[PDB]
Design a protein around this ligand. Structure first.
Ligand SMILES: Nc1ccn([C@@H]2O[C@H](COP(=O)(O)O)[C@@H](O)[C@H]2O)c(=O)n1
Length: 147
């Protein structure tokens, strides 16, 4: 028995920001679609479409891109609704980016985030997707089985 979802959480509103120069917009798009699909079939409610298309940014502009995209996506929502998830694509070797990302999301935006390395985005294996779905589920308030 591999882990499974007991209670699937809900992601009605999500966006993706990409920080990897090896990843074009369409690949980010396709990756997120596969991830959304896995989350759904595993037992989550998960909108197949993001609030806004993926955007690509340089790691040096992490603060600016996050706050701007957060503001723009939120303003697009029905009044009172919030962004449930930010998917972030990172270079395999990203230095301080991961930590900066987390501090901003956790303590400034108050948004749940899931980071995904470029290497995994290119591979898009079903096992990887399943694992990330499990992580996302816990983060949005769902519950998974224990081994
Ligand atoms: N300081 C860190 C810690 C994790 N990561 C990476 O982020 C991923 C998981 O991100 P989450 O914390 O958002 O679940 C992994 O696949 C991992 O190797 C990183 O790139 N730098």
């Amino acid at each position: 028995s591999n882990k499974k979802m007991i209670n699937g959480g809900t992601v009605n509103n999500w966006i993706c920001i990409n920080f990897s120069r090896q990843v074009q917009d369409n690949l980010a798009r396709t990756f997120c679609q596969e991830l959304a699909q896995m989350c759904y079939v595993s037992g989550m409610a998960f909108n197949p479409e993001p609030v806004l298309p993926p955007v690509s940014a340089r790691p040096e502009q992490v603060e600016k891109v996050l706050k701007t995209r957060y503001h723009d996506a939120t303003s697009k929502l029905s009044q009172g609704k919030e962004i449930d998830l930010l998917i972030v694509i990172l270079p395999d070797n990203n230095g301080s980016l991961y930590g900066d990302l987390k501090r901003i999301c956790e303590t400034e935006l108050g948004i749940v985030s899931q980071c995904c390395l470029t290497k995994h985005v290119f591979k898009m294996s079903k096992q990887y997707m399943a694992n990330v779905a499990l992580k996302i589920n816990v983060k949005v308030g769902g519950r998974n089985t224990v081994l």
